[PDB]
Ligand binder design. Structure first.
Ligand SMILES: *[C@@H]1O[C@H](CO)[C@@H](O[C@@H]2O[C@H](CO)[C@@H](O)[C@H](O)[C@H]2NC(C)=O)[C@H](O)[C@H]1NC(C)=O
Ligand SMILES: *[C@@H]1O[C@H](CO)[C@@H](O[C@@H]2O[C@H](CO)[C@@H](O)[C@H](O)[C@H]2NC(C)=O)[C@H](O)[C@H]1NC(C)=O
Ligand SMILES: CC(=O)N[C@@H]1[C@@H](O)[C@H](O)[C@@H](CO)O[C@H]1O
Ligand SMILES: CC(=O)N[C@@H]1[C@@H](O)[C@H](O)[C@@H](CO)O[C@H]1O
Ligand SMILES: CC(=O)N[C@@H]1[C@@H](O)[C@H](O)[C@@H](CO)O[C@H]1O
Ligand SMILES: CC(=O)N[C@@H]1[C@@H](O)[C@H](O)[C@@H](CO)O[C@H]1O
Ligand SMILES: *[C@@H]1O[C@H](CO)[C@@H](O)[C@H](O)[C@H]1NC(C)=O
Ligand SMILES: *[C@@H]1O[C@H](CO)[C@@H](O)[C@H](O)[C@H]1NC(C)=O
Ligand SMILES: *[C@@H]1O[C@H](CO)[C@@H](O)[C@H](O)[C@H]1NC(C)=O
Ligand SMILES: *[C@@H]1O[C@H](CO)[C@@H](O)[C@H](O)[C@H]1NC(C)=O
Ligand SMILES: *[C@@H]1O[C@H](CO)[C@@H](O)[C@H](O)[C@H]1NC(C)=O
Lengths: 124, 145, 97, 24, 49, 262
């Protein structure tokens, strides 16, 4: 559970490591995706099968009113769960994490489309 | 600020209402981690240096090394080895280097005649019982005894 | 050769055989100190596997071509980003509008 | 009919959920 | 009615983790912006659809 | 020792269909619940594999080993025991030796001088026990390069079952100076031909041998000439450069494969 450059038996890759639910044959030392990407490895000391997750990343989106209207903005970390964003008001959605936004309950009419039913607006 | 970073993306001093994609945030990877099946067939170096009796120089022993990992870990790293040169790779770099195929040699000579084991050199050791080739890019070591 | 050779060897000429790493492009390290090639430190002006990185060229007339010394100049410059500071062997023309 | 990837292509979610279109 | 949204981290996809590659990309130029300004157009057009 | 024994009955070579036997796990790499494809050297499906016996009769001729091979034995009491591989076979190059003696397996790479009539020889008496007698394989090996040996066992030659009780099989291949051994074992109730249906051989071991290979021989169990050697059958087939598609399942083990240009 840290974003690292790993290497097992010379096999470099980038990600975070976790203990698998998957199970290898006795003699295999690398495992892959349907897209032929090392999705798994078996540590040549402990042999316990490790699944690899590539670190979470993406385009920061930014939500702004008119420059005329304000200098306030909310910063959106798309796809990323917010649990590693402080390594670089806050809320979480299927579409990403809204930082600098007051999460309200009242379902107003839409203006700034975000995803999975979410959209934003500027109000008191 | 993200406010200056959007003004920058747009190359503009005004921005109206919107959601603007920018700055591809990515976790700069925190450190490396490395794994190997721990070394167990280490190359059998004790008998090349620690052995109780070496041969006569006309009978100079030669034995083959293979199938193993070749640590300099107590070799170069003990100062009592009073001479050494690998001529092509720096003496620091042989733990990171590899071999295709190897033979190692063992014998005794006089301290004055140690300089004569250099390739393309003279004196009765060199010319009559231990001679070395013109390209020689194996390695060489010596110690007082 | 016909200048930089000396028959006893022209050992006025020195190089830096070692350093902690490669220097920066167009850098120049004047450091004299003993390079700690081995894991040991060395304190005082000498020690085991700490070596003098400044080492020497011999040059003599009895040495072969390409083993001989060569005299080198390396011209560097930048271009048209900015006002001129040297200009080539051409006369300025008339001007027309 | 029948989340990042190592190279940074991303499937990204819809604006309206599969419930909100049903509600339309 | 619509096709799935996509975006790509074109820099991570063309040479993941490499600064030496990144300085080669910085000779190519606008291709990384362009190759998501196109995909933004698709992404918004799904919402409008 | 070597003694050149000529004492057998005279027969031509036999042939049979390969069915879907002759695939291996192509790389040392896990996948599960996928249809995945490979291009490498493989036994073509439905090849006329050559078919050989021990009986009165003992099929052990010189075979070419172009691009490596598949080998399979339908067996009783461990009659098929070793393998011998090379190109000069007379000490003018290196060659490889792999056998299973009466107490240890031995694997060696040397400038060998193999026999003209090789085998592994055993005491055969009625006193309820069979033991090592003789080891006719080679004389010289004057340069060597590999040195591998098993832990000590006892591996029998006694038994009297009817039809073939066990199927043992191997792929042998020699690429970038390494050798690659793949195997499998499965019990059988089969009388005179290879099992239909499917499996893929696992990489049993890999060896740093370094020898260009052109021909192969096999070692079998047995006052020299005139002899009894037991009833066995085995089958030999080459490898062509061809694509294959594979089913890797929920367990990540192999389910099926397809020869692409069948
Ligand atoms: C890596 O080294 C260790 C020994 O240092 C080997 O594992 C040991 O095996 C016993 C088996 O019961 C365990 O109780 C020990 O805890 C293990 N030691 C450690 C430090 O984990 C291991 O076999 C070696 N790896 C390989 C591939 O052989
Ligand atoms: C070994 O087998 C062959 C018969 O095929 C014989 O060996 C020959 O021996 C002569 C020298 O006397 C050589 O010139 C031939 O080239 C050999 N041939 C081969 C293939 O080895 C001999 O009959 C047999 N030896 C014994 C002891 O039975
Ligand atoms: C597909 C194939 O090669 N079939 C061959 C056939 O051509 C040959 O006449 C016969 C004789 O052994 O053996 C089998
Ligand atoms: C237990 C036993 O018999 N071991 C021998 C082994 O020492 C020998 O090297 C080999 C050669 O055939 O044959 C077997
Ligand atoms: C790789 C190697 O060891 N080769 C030698 C060869 O040079 C020598 O001629 C022969 C016997 O003299 O023994 C072997
Ligand atoms: C040890 C040795 O020489 N192996 C040879 C290799 O050198 C050669 O390039 C190849 C082509 O025939 O055949 C094999
Ligand atoms: C935007 O704000 C400025 C004051 O900074 C004002 O002068 C301008 O008229 C405004 N524009 C519009 C279209 O409202
Ligand atoms: C908002 O709604 C959630 C349930 O959807 C509720 O748990 C929460 O207390 C509400 N908060 C406010 C500030 O209304
Ligand atoms: C040789 O053995 C002695 C201990 O008897 C030790 O001091 C020395 O470091 C050893 N060197 C090597 C290469 O084994
Ligand atoms: C009789 O049996 C013993 C083993 O109990 C065996 O060693 C011996 O070789 C047999 N006798 C003869 C004549 O072979
Ligand atoms: C695959 O896994 C299941 C569930 O654990 C197990 O029962 C089954 O025996 C496995 N398949 C084979 C071929 O063994």
């Amino acid at each position: 559970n840290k974003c690292v450059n790993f290497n097992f038996n010379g096999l470099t890759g980038t990600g975070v490591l976790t203990e698998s639910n998957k199970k290898f044959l006795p003699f295999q030392q690398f495992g892959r995706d349907i897209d032929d990407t090392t999705d798994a490895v078996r540590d040549p000391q402990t042999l316990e099968i490790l699944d690899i997750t590539p670190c979470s990343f993406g385009g920061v989106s930014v939500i702004t009113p008119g420059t005329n209207t304000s200098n306030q903005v909310a910063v959106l970390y798309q796809g990323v769960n917010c649990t590693e964003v402080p390594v670089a008001n806050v809320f979480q959605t299927r579409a990403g994490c809204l930082i600098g936004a007051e999460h309200v309950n009242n379902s107003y009419e839409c203006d700034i489309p975000i995803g999975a039913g979410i959209c934003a607006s500027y109000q008191t | 600020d993200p406010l200056s970073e959007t003004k920058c993306t747009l190359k503009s001093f005004t921005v109206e209402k919107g959601i603007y994609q920018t700055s591809n945030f990515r976790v700069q990877p925190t450190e490396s981690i490395v794994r190997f099946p721990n070394i167990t067939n280490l190359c059998p170096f004790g008998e090349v240096f620690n052995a109780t009796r070496f041969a006569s120089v006309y009978a100079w022993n030669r034995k083959r090394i293979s199938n193993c990992v070749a640590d300099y870990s107590v070799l170069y790293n003990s100062a009592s080895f009073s001479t050494f040169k690998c001529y092509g790779v720096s003496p620091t770099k042989l733990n990171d280097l590899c071999f295709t195929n190897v033979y190692a040699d063992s014998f005794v000579i006089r301290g004055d005649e140690v300089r004569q084991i250099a390739p393309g050199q003279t004196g009765k050791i060199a010319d009559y019982n231990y001679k070395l080739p013109d390209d020689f890019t194996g390695c060489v070591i010596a110690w007082n005894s | 050769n016909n200048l930089d050779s000396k028959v006893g060897g022209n050992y006025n000429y020195l190089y830096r055989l070692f350093r902690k790493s490669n220097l920066k492009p167009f850098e120049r390290d004047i450091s004299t100190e003993i390079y700690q090639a081995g894991s040991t430190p060395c304190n005082g002006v000498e020690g085991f596997n700490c070596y003098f990185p400044l080492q020497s060229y011999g040059f003599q007339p009895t040495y072969g071509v390409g083993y001989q010394p060569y005299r080198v100049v390396v011209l560097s410059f930048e271009l048209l980003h900015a006002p001129a500071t040297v200009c080539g062997p051409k006369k300025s023309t008339n001007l027309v509008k | 009919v029948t989340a990042q990837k190592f190279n940074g292509l991303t499937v990204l979610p819809p604006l309206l959920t599969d419930e909100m279109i049903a509600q339309y | 009615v619509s096709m799935t949204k996509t975006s790509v981290d074109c820099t991570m996809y063309i040479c993941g983790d490499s600064t030496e590659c990144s300085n080669l990309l910085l000779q190519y130029g606008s291709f990384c912006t362009q190759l998501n300004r196109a995909l933004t157009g698709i992404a918004v057009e799904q919402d409008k659809n | 020792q070597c003694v050149n024994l000529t004492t057998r009955t005279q027969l031509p070579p036999a042939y049979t269909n390969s069915f879907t036997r002759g695939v291996y796990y192509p790389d040392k790499v896990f996948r599960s619940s996928v249809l995945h494809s490979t291009q490498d050297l493989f036994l073509p499906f439905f090849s006329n594999v050559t078919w050989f016996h021990a009986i009165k009769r003992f099929d052990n001729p010189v075979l070419p080993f172009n691009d490596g091979v598949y080998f399979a034995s339908t067996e009783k009491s461990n009659i098929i025991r070793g393998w011998i591989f090379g190109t000069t076979l007379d000490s003018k190059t290196q060659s490889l030796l792999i056998v299973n003696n009466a107490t240890n397996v031995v694997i060696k790479v040397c400038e060998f001088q193999f026999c003209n009539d090789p085998f592994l020889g055993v005491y055969h008496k009625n006193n309820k026990s069979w033991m090592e007698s003789e080891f006719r394989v080679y004389s010289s090996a004057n340069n060597c390069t590999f040195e591998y040996v098993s832990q000590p066992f006892l591996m029998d030659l006694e038994g009297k079952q009817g039809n073939f009780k066990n199927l043992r099989e191997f792929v042998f291949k020699n690429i970038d100076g390494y050798f690659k051994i793949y195997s499998k074992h499965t019990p059988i109730n089969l009388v005179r031909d290879l099992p239909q249906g499917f499996s893929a051989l696992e990489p049993l071991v890999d060896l740093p041998i370094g020898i260009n290979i052109t021909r192969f021989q096999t070692l079998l169990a047995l006052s020299s000439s005139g002899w009894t050697a037991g009833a066995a059958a085995y089958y030999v087939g080459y490898l062509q450069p061809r694509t294959f598609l594979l089913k890797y399942n929920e367990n990540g083990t192999i389910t099926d494969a397809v020869d692409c240009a069948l």
